[PDB]
């Protein structure tokens, strides 16, 4: 067998200086707060939900509302979402306190989270009631029927 | 595919190292590999190439060749450089005082050089008193005086030496070497 030599070093070189300075994400023009979204993956796939805020994690803050849907305040990825053309006025909904640290990992749900759910859903429902059948629309699941071609459908 | 205008993967055809495994010749190559790589002096690149040469490509240099080279105009105090053996010549009537650097000296050659007030130094001693080969003069021995070259390119009307084991009137002198025996070539 061939023994190792003295010139076979074990030191790990430092990496070169990388020039991959990150630049901000660009969302689709159809992704505007208040837009009704369709979730395509995850536990709540097929659920119609309201888009509220763009978090700094590149995720979207979303609520069902929980009373209408059972979908709570949570994050979704923009690529697992169909952004429809239906919109709800969310200018009266306060989503200031919600950010990445809000959804930090620490079943039992926090009292703060339940309170925020109720407070947000109150304003969301008040604005949702204005559009007839919008509450019924949000409470119904989405599915592709026979003869539905998503390359031809408008959402 | 490529339309090749020359043969592919062709080695240069020149020695890049000595065939010799003499460690001391390899120390000289180490010294002149550094000098040729770093001095811009054309002398050091020539010496490095000559250290690679085979024995027949480094013919012995007689002490008479050095004497004739020192008799060139303005070359009496130059340093004679021989990459090879310097041999003695008992046909000289006199030898000057000279500095000669060689791979090897015969006993007679070194004796005659030192007897006349000169120096017989090695090529490493040369590299310290002349690291750029200043005031030097490279002397090479005759290559075509070798006995093997007598028979190279033998043919009709070529005038070369036949490859023959015995010499005499009975050995390849009659037919083809004489018009009285047919033809002569």
């Amino acid at each position: 067998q061939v023994a190792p030599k003295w010139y076979q070093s074990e030191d790990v070189p430092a990496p070169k200086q990388t020039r991959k300075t990150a630049r901000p994400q660009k969302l689709r023009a159809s992704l505007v707060p208040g837009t009704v979204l369709i979730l395509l993956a995850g536990r709540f796939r097929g659920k119609r939900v309201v888009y509220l805020k763009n978090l700094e994690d590149n995720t979207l803050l979303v609520s069902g509302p929980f009373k209408v849907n059972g979908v709570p305040l949570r994050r979704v990825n923009a690529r697992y979402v169909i952004a429809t053309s239906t919109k709800v006025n969310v200018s009266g909904v306060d989503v200031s306190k919600f950010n990445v640290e809000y959804f930090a990992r620490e079943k039992e749900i926090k009292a703060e989270r339940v309170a925020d759910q109720k407070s947000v859903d109150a304003a969301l429902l008040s604005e949702i009631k204005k559009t007839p059948l919008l509450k019924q629309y949000l409470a119904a699941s989405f599915s592709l029927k026979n003869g539905d071609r998503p390359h031809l459908l408008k959402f | 595919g490529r339309d090749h205008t020359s043969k592919q993967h062709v080695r240069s055809g020149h020695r890049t190292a000595p065939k010799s495994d003499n460690v001391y010749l390899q120390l000289l190559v180490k010294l002149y590999s550094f000098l040729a790589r770093r001095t811009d002096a054309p002398f050091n690149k020539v010496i490095l190439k000559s250290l690679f040469l085979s024995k027949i490509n480094r013919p012995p240099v007689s002490v008479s060749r050095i004497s004739r080279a020192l008799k060139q105009k303005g070359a009496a105090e130059k340093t004679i450089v021989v990459v090879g053996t310097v041999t003695d010549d008992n046909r000289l009537l006199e030898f000057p005082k000279a500095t000669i650097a060689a791979l090897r000296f015969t006993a007679g050659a070194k004796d005659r050089i030192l007897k006349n007030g000169g120096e017989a130094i090695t090529l490493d001693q040369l590299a310290l008193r002349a690291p750029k080969g200043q005031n030097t003069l490279i002397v090479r021995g005759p290559r075509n005086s070798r006995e093997a070259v007598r028979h190279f390119g033998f043919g009709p009307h070529k005038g070369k030496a036949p490859r023959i084991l015995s010499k005499g009137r009975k050995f390849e002198r009659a037919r083809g070497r004489r018009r009285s025996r047919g033809f002569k070539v």
Binding site: - | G1, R2, D3, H4, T5
Partner: protein, 144 residues
């Protein structure tokens, strides 16, 4: 074969710039069944030199990624920039020979969109070889 070698066209889809005289025209006539040529515009020359421009530096194929590379090899001919080189090629200049020989032969891809149905017949007869004269620009756009 010798003519194509002297034009430095020793592979398929290799491109070279030639200054038209009687001698070079009579050269190109011999290689006509094997080449497609025409009159290149300034933008075609610029795109070729920018994307696939390489220089012959010590018999090595070196990318023209900095003006120092061009200057170190063509400054004695007053070429100090990639645009000097493009100008010297386009308006065939007094140092066209050195500038065009400094350029390594362009190695183009196959056309995006293909050739005509059968390449190896003259462009006049519905093929691809010979002189197409301004349609070399469309072909280079396909291949560069």
């Amino acid at each position: 074969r010798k003519v194509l070698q002297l034009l430095r066209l020793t592979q398929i889809n290799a491109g070279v710039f030639v200054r038209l005289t009687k001698a070079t025209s009579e050269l190109i006539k011999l290689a006509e069944p094997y080449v497609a040529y025409g009159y290149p515009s300034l933008s075609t020359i610029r795109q070729l030199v920018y994307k696939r421009g390489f220089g012959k530096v010590n018999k090595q194929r070196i990318a023209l990624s900095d003006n120092a590379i061009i200057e170190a090899n063509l400054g004695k001919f007053n070429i100090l920039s990639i645009e000097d080189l493009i100008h010297e090629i386009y308006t065939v200049g007094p140092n066209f020979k050195q500038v065009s020989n400094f350029l390594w032969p362009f190695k183009l891809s196959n056309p995006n969109g293909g050739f005509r149905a059968r390449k190896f017949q003259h462009f006049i007869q519905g093929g691809d070889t010979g002189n197409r004269e301004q349609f070399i620009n469309a072909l280079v756009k396909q291949m560069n």
